[PDB]
């Protein structure tokens, strides 16, 4: 009783889908990708329920049930299937066994990672590894599983009725960004101009002294350079180096006109500043946030691997996940399942759970660390279709990024954002949102704004202001 999605290439994938599509009647009305979604999920009732709750557990059931509405029929079947395809599963799982070295940074520190804030080297390692993995196994079969490099989406059309809540969510998101952190535009601005080869600027830096240092006590040059990098990528450090090299040429050419000791000290200091800018950039909190985002497919495979799952054994995981999405089960049942089953991977996967180990604010958690909540990442990957009996998918299994598959476009009235907002509304009416470490609605919303349209797209490269 193995895995019925027998697929190794895009072509076979297409034929599989077609044979499935005929039997199941997928509709692409509200969904970006073909899905079981007949009618737009409507969650209005849940906020009313939430309001009439008295007990937190009840509030919890409510939120979960509301969530399952959004997820239950939205799964993008083609991509989910691909991701659970026999070919992908084999390669995906096999990949980590080949690449011990690539993943050493964090994989070998899983235990500490379970409790501690990750070194940026550990985040950056992950982010790179994910991309390599996708490349190696030929994960990307279409735009929906592509690794995004997208602009970063300034403008987003939203239905009027929700604008107020939409406004509310971002305000909260902006606040969260604010506390993370806590003249203004020329020390950075001076750097861009310099960076573009206007090396002359070095003679008259605006602070007057190349080495003047702001409240930080660190050079404005190094600071501005670092901020400039966060904004326009690490390309600039190289550009900066060329510019300094060029300036070195200029003084060399005018040897007689320039004091050689002064000249040498300067070129030196700029180099020292550049270095500081790079050390600054590494520990950029900005970089950390950008680097900290789960690549849903990558981690889900990582956990599979880490847990000892195998292609032969994988269908059991699909069932497990599939069952969780059908209706909310609570985590005790899920945990109980893991502990009960004769499947060896059951207890293994359970060990990876850091819910009880991690002592830092949750946002700081590495994205390769498993928590009960993140089980949802895997669920979308393998949980929407029970690979042993794919038709039972028609029955419906709800997972969060299943939500991402709803449509943003105005013609259909942006059902995606409409849905996200309501989730948020439901959560806000039950709970003191401002207090929570992590608000799922906000994360989703941010993700859509960056232009993610699939759970399986990777947005590490996508750089954007809001």
Curated annotation (Swiss-Prot):
| UniProt domain comment | The DEVD motif is a CASP3/caspase 3 cleavage site essential for viral replication in host cell. However, the importance for viral replication is apprently not linked to caspase cleavage. This motif is involved in homooligomerization.
- Gene that codes for this? N
Q: What is the effect of changing residue 401 to A?
A: Loss of DNA endonuclease activity
From the broadest rank down, the organism's phylogenetic lineage runs: Viruses, Riboviria, Orthornavirae, Negarnaviricota, Polyploviricotina
What InterPro entries does this protein's entry cite? Nairo_nucleocap (IPR003486)
What is this protein's record name? Answer: Nucleoprotein
Q: How is it modified after translation?
A: Cleaved at the DEVD motif by host CASP3/caspase 3 in mammalian cells at 48 hours postinfection giving rise to cleavage products of about 30 kDa and 22 kDa that remain associated. Only the monomeric form is cleaved. Little or no cleavage in tick cells. Caspase cleavage reduces the viral polymerase activity. Caspase cleavage is not required for productive infection in mammalian or tick host cells.
Q: Does the keyword Hydrolase apply?
A: yes
Q: Could you tell me what the cofactor note in this record states?
A: Endonuclease activity is stimulated by divalent cations such as Mn2+, Co2+, and Mg2+.
């Amino acid at each position: 009783m193995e895995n019925k999605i027998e697929v190794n290439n895009k072509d076979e994938m297409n034929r599989w889908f077609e044979e499935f599509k005929k039997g199941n009647g997928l509709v692409d009305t509200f969904t970006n990708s073909y899905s079981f979604c007949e009618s737009v999920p409507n969650l209005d009732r849940f906020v009313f329920q939430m309001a009439s709750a008295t007990d937190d557990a009840q509030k919890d059931s409510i939120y979960a049930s509301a969530l399952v509405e959004a997820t239950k029929f939205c799964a993008p079947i083609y991509e989910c299937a691909w991701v659970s395809s026999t070919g992908i599963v084999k390669k995906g799982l096999e990949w980590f066994e080949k690449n011990a070295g690539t993943i050493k940074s964090w994989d070998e520190s899983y235990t500490e990672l379970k409790v501690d804030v990750p070194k940026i080297e550990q985040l950056t390692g992950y982010q790179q590894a994910a991309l390599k993995w996708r490349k190696d196994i030929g994960f990307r079969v279409n735009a929906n599983t592509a690794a995004l490099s997208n602009k970063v989406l300034a403008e987003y059309k939203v239905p009027g009725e929700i604008v107020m809540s939409v406004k509310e969510m971002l305000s909260d998101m902006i606040r969260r960004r604010n506390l993370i952190l806590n003249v203004s535009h020329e020390h950075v601005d001076w750097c861009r101009e310099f960076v573009k080869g206007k090396y002359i600027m070095a003679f008259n830096p605006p602070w007057g002294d190349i080495n003047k240092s702001g409240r930080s006590g660190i050079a404005l040059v190094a600071t501005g350079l670092a901020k400039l990098a966060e904004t326009e990528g690490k390309g600039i450090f190289d550009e900066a180096k060329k510019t300094v090299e060029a300036l070195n040429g200029y003084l060399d050419k005018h040897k007689d006109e320039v004091d050689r000791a002064s000249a040498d000290s300067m070129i030196t200091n700029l180099l020292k500043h550049i270095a500081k800018a790079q050390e600054l950039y590494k520990n950029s909190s900005a970089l950390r946030a950008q680097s900290a985002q789960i690549d849903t497919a990558f981690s889900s495979y990582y956990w599979l691997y880490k847990a000892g799952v195998t292609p032969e054994t994988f269908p059991t995981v699909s069932q497990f996940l599939f069952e969780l999405g059908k209706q909310p089960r609570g985590t005790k049942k899920m945990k109980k399942a893991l502990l009960s089953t004769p499947m060896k991977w059951g207890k293994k996967l359970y060990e990876l759970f850091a819910d009880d180990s991690f002592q830092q604010n949750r946002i700081y958690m590495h994205p390769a660390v498993l928590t009960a909540g993140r089980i949802s990442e895997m669920g979308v990957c393998f949980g929407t279709i029970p690979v042993a009996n794919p038709d039972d998918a028609a029955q419906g299994s709800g997972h969060t990024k299943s939500i991402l598959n709803l449509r943003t476009n105005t013609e259909t009235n942006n059902p995606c954002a409409k849905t996200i907002v309501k989730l948020f509304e439901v959560q806000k009416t039950g709970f003191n949102i401002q207090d929570m470490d992590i608000v799922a609605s906000e994360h989703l919303l941010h993700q859509s704004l960056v232009g993610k349209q699939s759970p399986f797209q990777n947005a590490y490269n996508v750089k954007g202001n809001a």
